[PDB]
Structure formats: structure tokens, C-alpha cells
Design a protein around this ligand. Sequence first.
Ligand SMILES: [Mg+2]
Ligand SMILES: [Zn+2]
Ligand SMILES: [Zn+2]
Lengths: 764, 284, 186, 107, 99, 220, 174, 58
Amino acid sequence: APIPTVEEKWRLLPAFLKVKGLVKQHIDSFNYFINVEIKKIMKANEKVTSDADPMWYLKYLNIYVGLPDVEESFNVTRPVSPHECRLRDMTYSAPITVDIEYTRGSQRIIRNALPIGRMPIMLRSSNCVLTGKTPAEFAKLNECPLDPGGYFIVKGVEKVILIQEQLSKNRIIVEADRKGAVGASVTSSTHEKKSRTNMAVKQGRFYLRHNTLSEDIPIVIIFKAMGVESDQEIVQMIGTEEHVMAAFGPSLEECQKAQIFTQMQALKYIGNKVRRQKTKIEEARELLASTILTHVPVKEFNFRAKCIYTAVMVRRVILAQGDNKVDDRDYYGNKRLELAGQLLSLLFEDLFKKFNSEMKKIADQVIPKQRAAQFDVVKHMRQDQITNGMVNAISTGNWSLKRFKMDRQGVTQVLSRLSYISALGMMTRISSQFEKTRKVSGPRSLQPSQWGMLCPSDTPEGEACGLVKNLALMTHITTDMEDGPIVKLASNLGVEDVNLLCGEELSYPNVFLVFLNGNILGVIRDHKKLVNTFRLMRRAGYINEFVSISTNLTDRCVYISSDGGRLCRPYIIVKKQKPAVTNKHMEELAQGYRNFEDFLHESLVEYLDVNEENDCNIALYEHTINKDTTHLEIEPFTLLGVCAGLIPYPHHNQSPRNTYQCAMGKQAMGTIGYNQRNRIDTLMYLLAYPQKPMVKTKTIELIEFEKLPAGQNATVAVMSYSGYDIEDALVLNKASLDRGFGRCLVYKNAKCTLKRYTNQTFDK
Amino acid sequence: PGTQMTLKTASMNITLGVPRIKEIINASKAISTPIITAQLDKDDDADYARLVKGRIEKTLLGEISEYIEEVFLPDDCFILVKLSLERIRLLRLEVNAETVRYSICTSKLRVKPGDVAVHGEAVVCVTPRENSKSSMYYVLQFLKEDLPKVVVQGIPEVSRAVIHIDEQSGKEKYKLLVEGDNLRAVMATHGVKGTRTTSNNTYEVEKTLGIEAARTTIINEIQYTMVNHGMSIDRRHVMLLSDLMTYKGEVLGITRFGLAKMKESVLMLASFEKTADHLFDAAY
Amino acid sequence: RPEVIQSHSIFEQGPAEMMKKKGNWDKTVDVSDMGPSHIINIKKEKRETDEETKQILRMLPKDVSVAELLRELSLTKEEELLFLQLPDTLPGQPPTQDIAENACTLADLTEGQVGKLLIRKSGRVQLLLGKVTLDVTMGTACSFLQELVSVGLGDSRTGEMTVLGHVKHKLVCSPDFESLLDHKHR
Amino acid sequence: MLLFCPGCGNGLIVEEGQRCHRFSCNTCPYVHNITRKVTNRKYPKLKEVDDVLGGAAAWENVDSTAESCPKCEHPRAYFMQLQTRSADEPMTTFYKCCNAQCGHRWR
Amino acid sequence: RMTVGKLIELLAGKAGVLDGRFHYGTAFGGSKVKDVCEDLVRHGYNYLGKDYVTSGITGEPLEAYIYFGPVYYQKLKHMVLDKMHARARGPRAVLTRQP
Amino acid sequence: DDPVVQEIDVYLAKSLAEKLYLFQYPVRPASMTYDDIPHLSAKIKPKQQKVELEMAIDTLNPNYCRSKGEQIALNVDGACADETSTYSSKLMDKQTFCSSQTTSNTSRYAAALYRQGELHLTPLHGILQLRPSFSYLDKADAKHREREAEQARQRRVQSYEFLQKKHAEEPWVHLHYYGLRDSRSEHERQYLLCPGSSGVENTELVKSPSEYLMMLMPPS
Amino acid sequence: KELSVIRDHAGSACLRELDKSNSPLTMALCGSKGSFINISQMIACVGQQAISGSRVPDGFENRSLPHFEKHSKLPAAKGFVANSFYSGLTPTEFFFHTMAGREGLVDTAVKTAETGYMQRRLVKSLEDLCSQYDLTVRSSTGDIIQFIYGGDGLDPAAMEGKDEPLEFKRVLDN
Amino acid sequence: QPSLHKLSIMAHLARVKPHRTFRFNECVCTPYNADFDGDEMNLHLPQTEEAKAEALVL
Ligand SMILES: [Mg+2]
Ligand SMILES: [Zn+2]
Ligand SMILES: [Zn+2]
């Protein structure tokens, strides 16, 4: 008997596109920025203190962004549309108002709105003038209803912050060395530090390397430096099997060659190795508790939780040299996508700290010197620093932050307006990390981990084939979570603490670690109970539904990830060979008694991450479900992207032809939008008589390509004619060309500025 | 024809295509996957094949020793190694305990011939001495892991070998593909016909059989790589390329160092790399 | 060193190798029955797996909760010390302890009977601590020494330190989230 | 093998005393006189014999009154037992028959 | 190139203009060939799109049938009037006197 | 299924509620107890618990090397000072254990003296790891090094020197050790029992399953 | 081997039932554009999709996609396609085919920086060589590379035979 | 433009024609590896009679 199919299961996709995916990724990141992260940066820098003349301070109370404005010549302001900002070649910005509390002799002096700078507002975000409006009210603003939004406007050009792809920080990566060695490393990044530690086996003895230390030091010296001195506890934390000890032997035999037996002696040994930026012991103790493996916390200089972590690193090196199961940089569970919010956070943080430092410098110069009368800092808020910083970093494309050592170039691109699909396609690119170093042919290939997260067909052809990729139709990038209740749920579920044991329990066959974004929460027996109970607490809504949990049965670690920037994707839950979505549910969706979030909370749809779908068994169609299924694919045509959605019958072609079509579909002359006659752009191609396609995909109906199309239905004979059509050439018709086929208008621009000089003389 | 090669292709993986032509004309001393094709005189039986195969393939002491043990006695401490002479008899080797005595004392921590005994026909003890150079008398742990990694029989540079068979109906003979980079040793073992064996690595043939055999090796190897991809080059072109590399007695590259030895020029090399040091030294 | 080593077709006898190997190390100088030569049987060196400490001698599977309590009840009538981890909040009120729905530890409970440990059929061990049923599972089994000591500071500057016994096993108590959610779904 | 001091848990080294060889700590007085034979066996992995026995090898395990092979019911077959890994493995039994107009491989 | 999707797009568009529908060419689904064959045969065209076609040059009919149908062509931006370029002699650089 | 066996009542005791600790030795197996070794001194601080023990090792046993013991005793202390010393005699007799604290809150761990069908809980006041200390080599190198030869806002709470100074101010407490074999351990072991009836209904632990799931999982 | 037998027998079955005056068959017989592999691949059965000369490597933990059981080595689960281009690929087969196609695309992207640098080195090394009037090939300084060009002294651009200057049987029939 | 072998540059005898594209015979597509899909090809007009003659003969 055939399993009965839910035939209207397709509707879960247009209901999904109302909320998430299809440039709403950028908008939900920028809303997160201007609603929590600017307050968090203000909380991290809430009080400045001048060095000379203390007990005088500036205290920021709260910060705001508000609606966009414009500054004019006669000190008059008026709210603005985006289209006026496109025409007049200005930047569509809103002023940052912050309320301060400070001292002028009188100890409590307050203000409620002190404007310090202008944030560029991304279109259709929470502060933009466009959102929530009806298609009758976009006419009075001269803005297209189908213009996707998510691009800034700075100095009249439309700029898009591209989705940057990174390697996931704070995670143990076992890689091969150039000369045949196998070493591990973790780029330990928190908000206050980024540094890469290592682990090298260059003689059969485990050396640790770091940018701080002048020379690599052996690992057992470091274990003795971190408050565990007995060699038995070290080898217990490493492992109790025979060949682990046999591989670790010459590292023990090194530490008995020198006289390192006491923690003070080991810290003295390290204190000679430190590059000097109490000199011996404190510069090694603060180095261990602040810079080597900095993503692991030290409470009261209790180094136990860092000893366990570096023992896990050395155990993975030893078990990796036995059988070469190294990890790869290309698995997309280990990637994280950095959206527009997580670059504007860094930019605003660096600019705000330079603002506070410049203000503290001016305050330190002017207080002890000029006059006994207490000045105010309100006369010293030069807004040009914040405004020029934000605008130059968006409009130029380089993010040189010396605080964070980030020197990325070419983040922003001018939004290409050749057609509608060009705009909608550049709003979903993912620029890769390497950015054309050399032809490595490792990350350029299509890995199978990109199933349903990224587009298999759409990639550029040329020098960048495979680096620039495009998001799929039905994906979602997570934001940062609160990190709170995951720990409290994990502690109640039988996770014993790591401090209540020696390392011998780490090498048992029944004991799995748990991690949380790279930090050990403890150990656990019966991991299946933990994973299933945690998933049933996720589906009921007590945990935020993007928290994924997976199990690595080889390395014996149960990951629980909660950081933001990783790719999730909805599925239909299958419980004992039946789908959880019944026809009554899709009928209630088609009538309007429920929406997609109510599918999330009734345990019908859940978001798998890439790491979590490593363990799930996904069935594509209903007739593939067997006894070991957990999730059902919602719609399999959402495997392909947006630009591959133009193709009719793409599963009949040879796959290079789909990539050539994904390149050529961004260049098709069409119609930009309904505002295309009020719009002065640099180079705009229109088609005189566009037509909607005769064989259309469902993607065309979703992204509304049939409302403003690009191309004309042509009566095509397929025959050989007159030999002028040899290598891909095609013969047209003269009468069709005369009656209007392929007629196209080309609009160009010519601008002239008439500036007033510093002298009172003007161009004329 | 490098543009027409799509890097297209049961064991012995060889690099073909553009990287093989690049490895040939660079004339580097060590190439990835060298393969020595050896010929056997008595090409009839696999029993004759596996004898010389064991004579040239590297076999480790741990691969024949059934157990290697550290024994502590009250009067002495030593490392007893019992050889599995059944597996020696089946692998058809010319080794016994006295051969394992001689293979040890070859560059291992300055051990002495008196330090090794030959107690049985199957057992060997190794009594360690103090190293007296940044080590402890408990160096038995170094010897307990290092001693299975010593080689008692075979060529020290050959990683592995494989028997290869022919297909024609009139005959059946066994050639011996050897993945190693010491041609002089493979040519000199008993049972391998040294007058008909070749290589891939041109520098080894230069070191062993002369410059003119290096010229012939470069010709045959470029034309082999070109024929495997279906492209055809007339033999005069690769002949002139091979004569350009070996007209100064030594195989030279097409890299900047060999081009510096062929071309005397200054501005030619200054166009290539090395910002201003060539110009200021040539002025000097 | 003579390099040209000679070999022969003859097959080595198995026992001849066995008895040569035997004669190479079965020799013993144990005749010195003296103080220095003697050795203390309760202070042997520690082989690394702590369950497997005995390398020299005079000549394991994992238990479950019902098996542990079955041994401790029927197999021996001797009392035994366990060490159990509880969840962070117990389903109770602090009685007149000046409150806000905080944690309710054992330090806010009174003496007396506080619950009933129900061992069900076939391995399932529940800790009925009221209306709600906690679940009991065997934790990570320690093998090193755990001493259960008492410290009583009866005088201001000096006091009594007393060991009550050795702790062998560990329990873990964890809530039943499946039952707590199947009472009222969300 | 690593052995550790019951007192301080540093790694022991072997040295020689006035009556015996001793395990001794480097950092505390603990010493342990080696009174009797103590050993530690590695048992490494031997070579694969699958292609070594194929093709009329020098086998010898055949004996008088040996069983006939089960298919042909003739004693025209060799049989052998070998360890495939280290000598702690229980020896496996295998046999191959080679007769006129009859080639087979069995276990 | 094995673009059989163009051969099905042509057929399904031809079967769509004859009775006012839009057929779907959705990935991993969409309207099959067996439906649009019957939709063409209901209107009097061939069930495979090939048509009897008369040559305009000679007036005589053609030996093989010809495959007509409406395919969605789209004009790309690379036009020859923007790419045709020539230089006889003109402006040179000031520093290196070359064009 | 029905709970056919072992309806074990779980009782709660509070007499040793502030006294009971749990020591664990990370480097010593289960068979090698400390029931025979004589204990010399026990040092403790009640707040910021940091227990330090000293255990005596005998000398006339064969496992003691006097040729090294004389040398290490000469290395640590002075040759003829004998006023203040880490060792009374001329040989290394004492062995010092120093602790490190595992967790801050120990409210969620409780010992369970199981008896003939009944179970007695008792809350723990602390869990400590006792490791053997290597302070004597540092005192030896100290004796060797003495034998050879309107301010800005600061942060002392997050440094090492102030933390050692803050822990040094609490005075030590000396303790009389009592072994397992002594009668006093059997005398104080009955303080883990609680005098109570067989069946008494609890007036506490009355909160419903829904209140418990709401209680451990609070709304954000 | 068994999957190559499936593809080759499906090709030898699809070619036998085509009529003559079939357009892909005529374009493959005259060799103008295409081959029999393409006709078999878009009528009968698209073959094994081989990435770097092997089947699809596991991109997850011991499986290629989540849509298959762990540690399976079935034909459908490691890259083999059963459908033609006529009946259309299923989604897993489509993704494996795209994995096999992006290798060709990325090889064509590598090819320029892979081959142009080699040719630039060969040009800078070889460009001085010239064939003198006494039929020697001398370098820039005048040292002899070859005494006669290629042994015979003949141009590769004028070879009527297989690397030989004539083919006598054809000239005699002429 | 990507000049692989020496027949990526040859000399033709020009003829002028009205439309705006370089139009050569399709039998010459194999030396250039041209494909008529928007490909561009450069033109070079020699300015000296010796350059004309060497182009025309060689
Ligand atoms: Mg082209
Ligand atoms: Zn010791
Ligand atoms: Zn037989």
C-alpha cells in the first residue's frame, strides 16, 4: 500500500517567505543591530573618565536612532524618501541621538537628546520610511513595491554589504602540516581578543606555539604551569589506552630532562619565552589566564577547565595520527555567515571607541589649563567623526579596524540594476573567505554539505568560479542567542561537571563530552536520552528553535551550538513513518487560521542546521519514507536558488548549461521596477515590449518575476538555414525586428556640479 | 596541448596532464610519485616474482616480529624480540636472527655489536647503554617504538612494489612496477634484468645511466604523457626540448635558475622577479 | 662485523625456540630473602588504568542502578555510601524562610521522609519525590579514592576531623521532561 | 610501560641499586626493587599473507589421513591456518582446492 | 550540450499558447511530456511539434519536418554598438609616450 | 509495569549539614586506601575552604631510599638549623597534601548512606580534590637562591597578589584527625541517620508537575 | 564495473532502435557535433558521475547526502544516476550531476593560470634557437644544440605520413 | 585574445562591408577557437610595406 501524499504540502513555502528568507535576512540582521547591539556597545562603553582631575565623568544613559532626516542650508529639517536621496546624490541617514549625564561642578547634569552622528539606514528596515506601507502609498514616495530592499544609499549610489563567509571560531581544527605532520589549532576569538594557538608534533613531542611566545614550548611544561603537577593526572587527562601513552611518552621524557617539577619553576620557564611587549612569574600567569586559549574562562585563576580542554586537543592529535581522519575546512557545518549587522557592529564599536578617546584627549587637555569655570562637553561633540566613518566605510569598501586587526577590502558592491533578477540575485550572494589567492581547487568544488543551503547551479563563470555563491530559496541565517537557558537545561539533564573528576572518565567508552560553542559543559552517560530530551524541549518552545544539537560518535562529543550566522533550513517532522503535516493543517493554512510560526510550535516543522542534519535521515518524497526517517523535505525545488529558478525544466539539461544561464540571467534587459521612469541611474537598459514567459517555474510566481519580466516570446524554428548560423549564431527575421521584436531603450546619465568655493566666488 | 588536457586519467596512481609536463621540464630532484619499471629475467612464475619482490620491497622488523618485549630482570634489563620464522618462511626472505643482528647497529643511538646477542635462531636481545647525550638510561622506551621501524631486508628508499601482468595470448610474463626513488639499487638486485629497466624521475636516470639516457628518458616521458591524453606532438619537438635541456652535460630546468645558466642576460632576468637586486648587483 | 651471513633450509623446531626463549629469562635471583630485597605488597607502583593497577601479582562491564541496589540489598546486608547529584530546583517551597520562586535546595527542606524511591520492573528506577517523578541514572563511575569526611569546629581555634567511609558509586537524579511535557503540552 | 609513584605520581625510571635494579622516582624517596621477571609485550601487526599463499606456495600443513575437501570429495587440496594479525589472534582455518577442470576458493 | 529542457520548453509553450494555459516547468516536477502531447493533438498539430514546412526560397516543401514553437528569448546587454572600437592615432600618455 | 520491588523510602538528615565534606584523591586508586597511614596534622580554613593535610611516610620499609632521602632532606632544610623546618628528623618523613576547590555552589550534591531498605540523604558543604603538593622543591630552590646570593583607576580584584593576600588573612584551624578504624567514626556515623517514623506525609514538596516545569524553566 | 556494464548495454540498446534520419544519430555518424555517448546519455541512461576519477566522496559523516543510510555503498547512494536526460533527474541525481559538472567548470577556470605560466617559461627558454644555413641549430651564443634538426632535418609542418616525410603507397596510387 | 598557438594571429585580405561586425569564414574558426557567442577579436593593420609583405607571405 502506498503512503498517502499530502499534496498541498507546497504551501509551507509561500508562508515561509512572508517572514524569513528572500532578502529579509539582511533586514532582520540590521533590525537586530539597531535594536540591541548599539545598546550593547553603549553598555560596553558607558563611562569615560578623564585622567587628570578625577571624579568628573561622562555617562551615556541610552542610545537611539530614530527616523531619517536631512540637513539643509537654513537649519531646517524635513523627513525624506529614499528616492529623493537617489536623485540629489546624498546619503539616506538617520541621526544617532544619545542621552548623557555629566558634571559641570553641579554633579548631576542631564540631557535627553544629544546628536553625535548619522547612521545610514538600510532600506525597508525598522527605521525606514518605506515599511508597512500599501502599494498606493509607494507612489507618493516614488519607490517600487517590488524593490527588495536591504541596500544602503550613500552619496547617491546603492551599496550592498555582501554576506561574508568565515570559518567558525572557537573550535578545534585538526589539520595536516606541510611537511607531513598533523597538528591542531583553534582560532580563539571572543569580543576582546583574537589569536590562533597551535599544537605541533615536530619531533614526536608535543610543542605548543603562539604569536606571543618567542619560541614554542613543550606541552607538559604548560600542563605543569596550569596548576596540575603530577604526571599521572596529565596522562589521565590525555588518555589511558596503551598507544596514546606510547605516543605521548617522549613528551613526558622531555619534561624530566629539564628540572620542571613545580608550577613556579614552569612559570619561570615560560617567563623567559615571552616576547616582552613583576616580570617573570606574573607575565606568564597572566599570559596563561588571558591569551593562550582565551575562549575558555578562568574564574579565580582555577586552571582546571583549561587543562581539560588542552587535554582534549592533545587527545585528538594522538587519535588523528593513528588513523588519518583529519577535519576539512570545507564542511559547511564549520562555516559561519557574517551579515550586515555583524559588520556594522564592529564598525560602530571602533568608531565609538575612537570618539570616546578623542573626547577624553580634548577633556584632558582643556581641564587643568584654561579657566576655573567648569566647561561643558556639549560644545565639543563633533559629529563629523561618526558620520564620515560610517559613510566612508560603507561607500569605499574597506573596514580597516586596527583594534580588531581586520583589513577586509571590497565588502560593499554597487547594486547592479541591469534588471530585476540582477538586483534580487546580488542581494543573496555569499562572498568566500580566500578571495582568489591561488587555484587551490579545494573550496571551489561543490561539496555535498551545501544541500539545500546554497545553490548548486548559480556561480559565476570566470576566475571566481565557485567562490561567490548564492543562497537557496528556503534558507535562514540565525542570529545570536541569549545563551542562558541552554546551560540551565543542560545541567538538569544529567551533565556532571568537569571539575568533579579526573581525566580517566574522559577515556571511558560510555562517556561523551558535551560542548557549547567551544566550551565544555561537562560529561554525560546515555547521550541518546540527552539528545532526544533536548529535542523534545526544543519542539515545545522552551528553547529557541534555532539551537541545534548533534552527536559525533567517533570523537565522542555532543555539540550544542547556539551562535548566530549559521545556516538553518525547515523540514517536516516524521514520527513513525507518517508526516506530521496532515491535510487539515494545510487547509487551515490555506484558510488563514494558522501561519508558519504555529507550525513551528506544534512540533510540525523544525529547523535543521547543517550539523544537526548530519545525524538526521531525511526523505525527499513521501514514498521514500521507511522506518528510519525523521524529517521530510518540504519542497525539493527549493534546492535551487533564485536565478536558477528562471530555468524551465532545469533537471533535463546538462548541468553546465544551468550555470551559464545563471550567469546570463543577470544580464537580461528587462524592467527595473515601476519607478523606472522617475529614476536617474548611471546606465539603465529597458525593453520596449516585455512579455511574461510562456513556460514558467513556481519560483517565477514566488519572486513575482511575471509582474515585470525580461524577454520576449519568439516563434523559434529549429532548423539549419543558409549557413550563417554555424557556431551558436542564430538568424533573425527582418519583419519581426521591424514590428518591434527586441526593441530596447538605453538610458545614460550626464551630471554636472556647480560648486561654491572657499573664496566667495561661484561657478556659473 | 596543455590546454586540451582536462587532468583526466588498479593501483600505482601516476600524475598525468599539465603537472606531469611541469614536473618534467622543471627537472626537480624529487618528484611526486616516481615509479621504476623493472624487468625480470625468469619472467614465468609468480614464485620467482615474489622472491625478488621481497628482495626489493621494504619490510619492517615489526612486520615479521611476532612480539617485541621489554623484560626487566633483577640483574639486567633488555629488549627481547622473537621473530616469527613461520612468516619468514612464507614470505620467502633471506633473513634469520644473525641478519637481524647485522641490520641493527646501523645508525641507532650508537649501539654496539656486543650489545646484541643471538640467543636462539628466533630470538634477539638488545641490551641498551646510556646515551650520555641529553638522554636517560630509560631510553628503552625510545628503542621499544623505534626498533619495529628498522628494516632488515629490502631497499631503504623503495616504499612499495606491485606485480603487474600482461594480457596477450601468446605469452604471459610478469613485470614489476616499483614505486621508489633509488634506481641504482633496483638495477643491482639479483633476479632483476638490469639491462631493460627504466624510470620516471629524470634526475635518477641522470645520476645512474648518464646524461644521454636522461635525454632519452625525457623524450619518452613527455611523449607518454602526451599520448595518454589523446593529443599528438611530432617527435622532433620533444626531441629539441630534450636536447635543449641537456646540451651542457647536466639536466637543467626551465625555472629561473636554469634559465640563468642558459641565458647570460640581465634585463631578461630583471623582467622576471627580484625587484632591484639584480640591477644593482649588475651595476656593481 | 661479518656481513656475508649464511642460511639453511632446515625448519626451526617450535619447542626449541620456546625453551631457548625460556632459558633466556626464567633465571631468577630471588634467593635474596632480605629486607632491602623484600617488597611491600600494598604499595606496588601504579599501572595507569586505575582499575588495572596490579601489573605485578602474587600469582569490566558497567552496572546499572537496579543491579547496584540489588547487590547492596540482597547480596550484602552491609551499609554503603552513595553520592547523588540532584537537579538545581526541587519541587518545593521554602517554609517561612523569607522567600520569589528561587532555588529550593535540600538546605531549605526539613528532616523526615522526603520521598520514595520506586524501582520498577526491568531497569527503570524512578525517584518519586512527591507528585512528580524524578529519574535516577548511573553517573560516571569513579575509580579513584573518595573519602567522606566530617569537619566539626567545636572550638573557635581547633576542631575535629573524622572520616565516615569510602564513597564508591555515584548517582545522578534528573527530571522526567517527557512526563512533565506530556502532562500539559505547550 | 609508564608506571607512576604512589606518593607523588611522577614518572618512574629504572636504575640499578646495590642488590637489584630498581624503579625509582626522581623527586621522592620511593623505590621499588625488581624482585621477579616483569614484561611488556607489544604484539605488532604482521604482513598480509593473502597474495603470499596464492599461486602454488611452499605449503606443508597436509598430513596423512587428512580430510577430503567437501565439494570434490578428494584430498587434492591444501589447507593451512595462520594468524592474520598479531599472535594473540586465534588462528583462522582456510583451504583451497585445485584439480583438473576445477578451480575454487573456500573458507 | 544535451539541453533537452529547451526541446520541452518549446513543446510545452506551443501546447500552452493553443489553449491559454501556462505550463509549469518547475524543477523536479512540472508538466510532463505525456500531457502536452495530448494537448497538442487535440488542436490539430502534431504530437511532437514537428510541422510540415514549405521553404520560402524555392517554394518546394522540405524533406524533413521542422520543429516550431514559442521559446522565451531574452536580449542581453552586450550590444555591438558599445563594443565596436577603433584607434588610428590619438591621445598618448604623458610619461610613457604610448597610447 | 508495576514497581514490584524495593519501595525504598528516602529520608533526609540535617545533623551534619554544615560539617560534611567529600574529599577525592585524583591520583590514588580504589584499593590503595589511607586506613593504615598515620596522620600528623590537618589544616583548614572554614570560609574559602582549602584543606591541607600532612601524612607521614615510614622509613624502615624497603620502598624508602635513604640514599636519596638524606640528600633531599639536606636540599630542603638547613643542615643544622632545626629551629624551623619542613622536617623534624634528618629524613623526609612528612608528605603534604594541598587542595583545590572544585565548585562554588555545592547545594546540589548529597551523600546517601543506604541501609536495609532505606536511604538517608545528607547535604554536602563542599567537595575538594586533594593532590600531593610539591612545595618542598620550591622551598629547596628558595634556600638555594638564598645560599647563592588622584591616581588612575586600577584593578586589583582581578590579579593574583591581591587574591593571595585576601586568602591569607583568614587564620588557620588545626584539627585532630581520626581514622576510619577508630570508635569515633562509628560514633559520628550515626549522625547521618534521622530519627523519624516509617510513614509521615510531607507537608512540603507539594508543587504540581506544571509548576515544576515552569519553575526550573523560567520565562525570559 | 557493473555500472559501466549498465551504461554500455543501455547505450547499445538505445542506438539499435533509433531510426535512420534521426538528427542526433546523423550528427554523430558524420562526426560534426556530438558522439554516441551523448545520444546514449540523453536517451538511455546517464552513467556514473565520477569526481576526480572515483565515486562521490562522503561529504557528511559516512554518507554522501542525508537522504541515504549510513555506510551504504549502493549504486544510487554514491553517485550513479538511472534516469536519462529525457525523463529528468531526481534531486539527489541532479545534485551529484552538478558536483560532477562543477569539476569541469573549475578545471577550465584553473587552466589559464595553469598553462600560461608554463608556456611563458618555455618561450623565454627556447626563443633564441634558430636553424642556421648549414643546418645546425645553435643557441644565442653559438653553442650547438643539435647538429641537424631532429636527426633528419625535416619540418614537422610538412609531414604527410605518421611522423615520416612521405607515405609511398599513397603517392604511387596518385 | 588568449593566444595559445601561433595560429591565434593570422593575416586576412580585408574587404569592406556595411554592418558592424568582423565577418570571417567559418572554416577559420578552428585556428582561433572562436565560437560566435559575443567573442571579440582584435584587428591589427600594419603600416609599412615590409610589414604587409611579411604578413602576407608568412
Ligand atoms: Mg566564446
Ligand atoms: Zn614518586
Ligand atoms: Zn581440486
